[PDB]
Design an enzyme around this catalytic site. Structure first.
Site, PDB file in Angstrom:
ATOM      1  CE  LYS A 268     -17.228   6.520  15.736  1.00  0.00           C
ATOM      2  NZ  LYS A 268     -17.628   5.335  14.904  1.00  0.00           N
ATOM      3  CB  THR A 269     -11.320   7.006  20.059  1.00  0.00           C
ATOM      4  OG1 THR A 269     -10.132   7.252  19.288  1.00  0.00           O
ATOM      5  CG2 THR A 269     -11.995   5.854  19.336  1.00  0.00           C
TER       6      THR A 269
ATOM      7  CD  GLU B 260      -0.973   5.674  15.133  1.00  0.00           C
ATOM      8  OE1 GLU B 260      -0.660   4.692  14.425  1.00  0.00           O
ATOM      9  OE2 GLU B 260      -1.973   5.678  15.877  1.00  0.00           O
TER      10      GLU B 260
ATOM     11  N   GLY C 156     -15.359   5.886  10.716  1.00  0.00           N
ATOM     12  CA  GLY C 156     -14.202   6.711  10.382  1.00  0.00           C
ATOM     13  C   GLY C 156     -14.011   6.884   8.882  1.00  0.00           C
ATOM     14  NE  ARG C 157     -14.617   0.810   6.833  1.00  0.00           N
ATOM     15  CZ  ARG C 157     -14.580   0.296   8.060  1.00  0.00           C
ATOM     16  NH1 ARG C 157     -13.678   0.703   8.948  1.00  0.00           N
ATOM     17  NH2 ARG C 157     -15.449  -0.649   8.396  1.00  0.00           N
TER      18      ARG C 157
ATOM     19  CD  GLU D 231     -10.144   0.661   8.610  1.00  0.00           C
ATOM     20  OE1 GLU D 231     -10.850   1.672   8.511  1.00  0.00           O
ATOM     21  OE2 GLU D 231      -9.076   0.627   9.258  1.00  0.00           O
TER      22      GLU D 231
ATOM     23  CG  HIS E 168       4.276   6.904 -19.661  1.00  0.00           C
ATOM     24  ND1 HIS E 168       4.915   7.218 -20.840  1.00  0.00           N
ATOM     25  CD2 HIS E 168       3.120   7.612 -19.658  1.00  0.00           C
ATOM     26  CE1 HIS E 168       4.172   8.071 -21.527  1.00  0.00           C
ATOM     27  NE2 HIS E 168       3.078   8.327 -20.831  1.00  0.00           N
TER      28      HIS E 168
ATOM     29  CE  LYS F  99      -5.592   1.288  16.958  1.00  0.00           C
ATOM     30  NZ  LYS F  99      -7.056   1.575  16.862  1.00  0.00           N
TER      31      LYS F  99
HETATM   32  O1  LIG Z   1      -8.967   4.420  10.031  1.00  0.00           O
HETATM   33  C1  LIG Z   1      -9.554   3.967  11.244  1.00  0.00           C
HETATM   34  O2  LIG Z   1     -10.753   3.244  10.975  1.00  0.00           O
HETATM   35  C2  LIG Z   1      -9.832   5.157  12.114  1.00  0.00           C
HETATM   36  O3  LIG Z   1     -10.527   6.124  11.341  1.00  0.00           O
HETATM   37  C3  LIG Z   1      -8.507   5.729  12.632  1.00  0.00           C
HETATM   38  O4  LIG Z   1      -7.838   4.779  13.453  1.00  0.00           O
HETATM   39  C4  LIG Z   1      -8.693   7.025  13.418  1.00  0.00           C
HETATM   40  O5  LIG Z   1      -9.412   6.800  14.634  1.00  0.00           O
HETATM   41  P1  LIG Z   1      -9.881   8.065  15.521  1.00  0.00           P
HETATM   42  O6  LIG Z   1     -10.697   8.921  14.574  1.00  0.00           O
HETATM   43  O7  LIG Z   1     -10.677   7.431  16.647  1.00  0.00           O
HETATM   44  O8  LIG Z   1      -8.599   8.710  15.976  1.00  0.00           O
HETATM   45  O1  LIG Z   2       8.250   4.902 -18.163  1.00  0.00           O
HETATM   46  C1  LIG Z   2       8.546   4.686 -19.528  1.00  0.00           C
HETATM   47  O2  LIG Z   2       9.264   3.461 -19.659  1.00  0.00           O
HETATM   48  C2  LIG Z   2       9.350   5.854 -20.026  1.00  0.00           C
HETATM   49  O3  LIG Z   2      10.283   6.222 -19.017  1.00  0.00           O
HETATM   50  C3  LIG Z   2       8.393   7.019 -20.309  1.00  0.00           C
HETATM   51  O4  LIG Z   2       7.507   6.659 -21.360  1.00  0.00           O
HETATM   52  C4  LIG Z   2       9.107   8.308 -20.697  1.00  0.00           C
HETATM   53  O5  LIG Z   2       9.906   8.096 -21.858  1.00  0.00           O
HETATM   54  P1  LIG Z   2      10.956   9.214 -22.339  1.00  0.00           P
HETATM   55  O6  LIG Z   2      11.974   9.274 -21.221  1.00  0.00           O
HETATM   56  O7  LIG Z   2      11.469   8.642 -23.637  1.00  0.00           O
HETATM   57  O8  LIG Z   2      10.180  10.499 -22.475  1.00  0.00           O
END
Ligand SMILES: O=C(O)[C@H](O)[C@H](O)COP(=O)(O)O
Ligand SMILES: O=C(O)[C@H](O)[C@H](O)COP(=O)(O)O
Lengths: 557, 557
Positions: free
Chosen positions: B211-212, B217, B272-273, B358, B389, B519
């Site tokens: 935008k700017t 970055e 932006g968002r 944001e 899980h 910033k």
């Molecule tokens: O997430 C922020 O609101 C802006 O979108 C982000 O900093 C990017 O800015 P820019 O589009 O001006 O580079």
């Molecule tokens: O994240 C859970 O605790 C278990 O890791 C998941 O349910 C997978 O189980 P399993 O390793 O017996 O398949």
């Protein structure tokens, strides 16, 4: 009531918080005490890099830390830790030992369960992993048409997925020369379908990762993979060249059609969310090499020894745990943000979202009492600097108190542009916690707007919006480099943080009855989705949602 | 005091909550009212699929919904909405219109800013995007060696990154015939380095999204990309074949060295968002084709019209907003979980982390007064079934109330095994919200423990661990299929949810002053990192961390 709330050291802490916390102001704490950083940080020399745990930007004084350490002693943290390490069955609801520390016990000091040393079997499986990794990585291991393996596919969910995924992502630079690694976890057919679309049955090795070997998502995914494979290979004996199992359930592995010789065993005392150090880590070792997997284990072992041998006041996981207790049980903060300034660590927060929340998302204590205080926080985060542009607005200027851990390696794996990118990354890492601490006073913002050329009317309108109240506490965790060793140490550090918090809350960090509930739920609804008939067996919402599914599933779009 | 807390409809709601909220039990609400699903859900027919918004599993009665709707009205939601749509400068701190609705205004009805219809310029840029998409996708647009483009790389951060990334991920099945798309965002040199490693300068086109056009970055990443490109092309005039820009700042785009004809413009009233609908969505249109991009816009337009025309009591984003107000300002829930049962939607939660947090992570009202109430929640989540899980343990059995939106398409993009995977996925989606509502009673768990062969002593001890209190509220949002159109409607729905909440809190959803301090401090630290000299210009923590960085950066590991 519950053990924590009945504890006089906790009530003293809480009373002090009520009387004194409003007077804790970070900016002023630093101004008043030039030694603040020195007295509220730990510089750990592992002999394979340093880890600096800087907890000075926290809403604490010497007296607060003293009270917290006394509470840990009063809650019997040292004895509980020793019981974990000695193989006592501290998982009391399941009557199991809790021995992820045995998995990485490089010293090979005996650790007994039921009178029997576990180390011989730990080491036997590690030897089997090492041998298998050499065979696959060298290109010696051939598929059913006689070609070397180019792709490895881990099929597993939860504890059998996120560890291997997070670690192979974090250690990507160490995967040169290794096979490509894929992770399939969701039952959602998209996951396996898109993975298989990019693969050849001739050069793909599947790893079915499941402690129980009965988990619906994993077995269904595994059966789908096997069907796809067999459609091409047309020979059941070819399965042994392309499918291995990581499990505790030999019978179910055999039933699925995998050779016991292709089974990499682990044990009931390995919790899923603590399992990457076991056979579950096979995809890590295949991707980055067994030597790097051993370094990962060794880093964890260093941190284990640190946790075991260090006085509580200088003990990194204990201090992190105690700061958490302070924010959770005294300040009432629901969440804990993990913000690694490292793209390779992009799944680190997600990993500990499981590790922390599945461990400590509990409400029944060892005594059978329902807790009358908060337990585990909601853990979340995204890597910096992206977070700064996504949700830091809320951290800085919202209405929530959010303890954040900021993490970064000093040395980058990619020092491009003579280090320019990493310089900027480091600058943001430092500046953000400085900003959260310091804020910006009305008079400071007023001077800025005056200098910017704003009219008295525009200045007054804009002013309150430009004010940062600050006093937002952080941990900064900085390490020499994100090597396999240092990563192992960092993961283990948080594992033990979680352990200490669980002991202090008097809950079982190592069961998961809510997760076990989950695995019992879908079976009732499954057959009801078949056919066109209306379902009236549930509450009207469940019923109505089923009607919608049945009405909408044949529509052409 | 602030507008919201001084509002008598809010006071009534809060008082009702205090006196009555303990009487609200989901199980009981459904038992007492067989019409509950029917009266607490909206089945929206878009003419391009249905979106069912089932809010019946919430801790609300008819009276509560009435009170919430009354509050929305008495906080000026209807007038504020009309002001947004008409181009009033509702972003009052920056004095800007808020017109993401104009970007997707398919009706082409005039929308004026400063007396000038914005639609001709919106449509001109869309036409330009369409033309560019034809040139690139057809292979007519050649790289510097005369080859067709195979890879597109979006470089941007936050609002210039998350939307395009989330949408291309979500709409992956619609990308046949399109170039591969890559997203570089982090300043961390890892991000661009690992991206460039897999690309040819001959067939890669970079989209610099800013935008700017000054974000450090993005411009640094862009300059790194250009350096990499020119090392191969060795001709500055070839940059025009491989670099385009999405910006509001013509001058800075020219300074970077991009052809002015290669610039896709947007406007200050595009946040932006809220920008994926504009030129910022170029990578979406390239990936899935312009027709699909138009369908995305049209879905958003449908939802805009729904929001505009529908009485508040049956207005989807309004009702979602009101439930959030109820949980945030009455129950005090810090967080809101987004849980899509869809792998393609894997970045949906991260997107609304920005969109929500944001926007509404604010503490100053329109009058300049500090809020004396909560504002925006912490938004988080991972796709189902994986969460079941991992952190659902805490949702089921922890100490936090966590409003959850469960989302799923009825039809899958990958109906493998005759729909088996999707049947299971749907079954889990349904069973989880049912279980969160119902829990498991002691009488139910007791019988299970009895049938499992547990001794009288073991049963007694295990019982409370196996019981689930339930009463955990959810929304279920179910849609025919995740098409470009339906995805567009869903994003727009949450955009308007966020808007309504912002108006009710009397905050500005459309500025982001909270990013400024971080910033400023980063610019100060950047040059200080260079060289060996000690840095003492900050607090002792910042100084200490810098000292650690300087000491550790030359250590060989
Ligand atoms: O997430 C922020 O609101 C802006 O979108 C982000 O900093 C990017 O800015 P820019 O589009 O001006 O580079
Ligand atoms: O994240 C859970 O605790 C278990 O890791 C998941 O349910 C997978 O189980 P399993 O390793 O017996 O398949």
């Amino acid at each position: 009531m519950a053990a924590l709330t009945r504890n006089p050291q906790f009530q003293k802490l809480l009373e002090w918080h009520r009387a004194n916390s409003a007077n804790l102001k970070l900016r002023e704490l630093f101004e008043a005490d030039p030694e603040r950083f020195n007295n509220f940080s730990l510089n750990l020399n592992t002999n394979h890099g340093h880890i600096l745990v800087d907890y000075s930007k926290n809403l604490v004084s010497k007296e607060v830390m003293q009270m917290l350490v006394e509470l840990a002693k009063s809650r019997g943290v040292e004895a509980a830790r020793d019981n974990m390490f000695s193989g006592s069955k501290i998982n009391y609801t399941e009557d199991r030992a809790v021995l992820h520390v045995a998995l990485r016990n490089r010293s090979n000091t005996p650790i007994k369960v039921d009178g029997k040393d576990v180390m011989p079997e730990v080491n036997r499986v590690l030897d089997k992993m090492k041998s298998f990794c050499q065979r696959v990585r060298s290109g010696d291991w051939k598929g059913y048409t006689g070609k070397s393996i180019t792709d490895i596919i881990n099929i597993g969910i939860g504890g059998s997925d996120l560890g291997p995924l997070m670690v192979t992502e974090a250690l990507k630079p160490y995967s040169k020369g290794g096979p490509r690694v894929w992770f399939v976890s969701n039952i959602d057919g998209t996951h396996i379908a898109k993975t298989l679309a990019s693969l050849s049955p001739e050069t793909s090795l599947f790893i079915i990762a499941s402690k129980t070997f009965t988990t619906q998502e994993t077995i269904t995914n595994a059966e789908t993979a096997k069907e796809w494979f067999l459609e091409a290979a047309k020979d059941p004996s070819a399965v042994a060249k392309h499918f291995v199992a990581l499990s505790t359930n030999t019978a179910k592995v055999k039933e699925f059609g995998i050779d016991p010789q292709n089974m990499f065993e682990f044990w009931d005392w390995v919790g899923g969310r603590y399992s990457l150090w076991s056979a579950i880590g096979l995809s890590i070792a295949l991707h980055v090499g067994f030597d790097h997997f051993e370094q990962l284990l060794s880093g964890a072992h260093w941190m284990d020894q640190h946790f075991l041998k260090t006085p509580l006041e200088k003990n990194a996981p204990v201090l992190l745990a105690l700061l958490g207790i302070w924010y959770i049980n005294c300040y009432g903060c629901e969440t804990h943000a993990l913000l690694p300034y490292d793209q390779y660590m992009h799944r680190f927060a997600a990993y500990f979202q499981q590790g922390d929340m599945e461990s400590n998302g509990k409400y029944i204590t060892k005594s059978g009492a329902r807790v009358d205080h908060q337990t585990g926080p909601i853990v979340w985060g995204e890597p910096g600097t992206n977070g700064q542009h996504a949700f830091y607005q809320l951290i800085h200027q919202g209405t929530k108190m959010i303890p954040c851990d900021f993490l970064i390696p000093v040395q980058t794996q990619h020092p491009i542009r003579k280090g320019l990118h990493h310089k900027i990354l480091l600058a943001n890492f430092l500046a953000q916690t400085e900003a959260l601490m310091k804020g910006k006073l009305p008079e400071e913002a007023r001077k800025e707007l005056q200098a910017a050329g704003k009219s008295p009317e525009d200045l007054e309108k804009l002013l309150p919006h430009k004010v940062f109240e600050g006093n937002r506490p952080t941990n900064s965790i900085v390490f020499t480099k994100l090597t396999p060793f240092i990563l192992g140490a960092l993961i283990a550090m948080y594992e033990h943080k979680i352990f200490v918090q669980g002991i202090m809350w008097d809950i079982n960090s190592f069961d998961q009855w809510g997760v076990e509930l989950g695995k019992q739920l879908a079976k009732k609804i499954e057959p009801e989705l078949e056919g066109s008939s209306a379902v009236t067996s549930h509450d009207s919402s469940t019923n109505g949602l089923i009607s919608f599914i049945k009405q909408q599933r044949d529509t052409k779009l």
